[PDB]
């Protein structure tokens, strides 16, 4: 649960992402894969990537970063009223992709890391607080659907 002022911060931060969605999405995925190499094994289409240079050169990885962040941005713009948008993603990630909730924690922290890396000094303490709460709400509502499905 976020206040109006916290949502305002979230959507202000998101404007930074929307200026370069593919560059942000690429770096989020690279931070996830290099920091937590077990996550790469969930992607049949990226498991061939052995080095970060290959990851950086992959146009399909940048494409997938755009897909991921476009979906997250659509959820964030709902300011918590995201049941219809979140349900299909929870279902596909539990039943088809088999993504443990832990990996959603990993990517949440990676988003925070990339924002500081690309906007040093321009991602203030209030903005980090609000973004973190929004990603926690997203993860918690996914977790509720995972529990319904019995997925661990
Ligand atoms: C911010 C969190 C994330 C968002 C918004 C997101 C969004 C999406 C979307 C929109 C798709 C395509 C449609 C679908 O299959 O449902 C997708 C595919 C996928 N997601 Fe996620 N995702 C997230 C986190 C992750 C994480 C943490 C992993 C694994 C570590 C992951 C693994 C996958 C895989 C394996 C696919 C299928 C890729 C393919 O072969 O084309 N997702 N995701």
From Swiss-Prot:
- Where is O2 bound in this sequence? 64
Write out the GO cellular component annotations: sarcoplasm
Which residues in this protein are found as Phosphoserine? Answer: 3
Main localisation: cytoplasm
Q: Which reaction does this enzyme catalyse, per its entry? A: Fe(III)-heme b-[protein] + nitric oxide + H2O = Fe(II)-heme b-[protein] + nitrite + 2 H(+); H2O2 + AH2 = A + 2 H2O
Gene Ontology terms: biological process: oxygen transport; removal of superoxide radicals
What's an example of a GO molecular-function annotation for this chain? peroxidase activity
Transmembrane stretches, start-end: none
Q: E.C. number, please?
A: 1.7.-.-, 1.11.1.-
Q: Which InterPro entries match?
A: Globin, Globin-like_sf, Myoglobin
Per UniProt, subunit arrangement is: Monomeric.
Cited function: Monomeric heme protein which primary function is to store oxygen and facilitate its diffusion within muscle tissues. Reversibly binds oxygen through a pentacoordinated heme iron and enables its timely and efficient release as needed during periods of heightened demand. Depending on the oxidative conditions of tissues and cells, and in addition to its ability to bind oxygen, it also has a nitrite reductase activity whereby it regulates the production of bioactive nitric oxide.
- This one is known as Myoglobin
Q: Which organism is it from?
A: Equus caballus
Q: Which gene is annotated as encoding this protein in its UniProt record?
A: MB
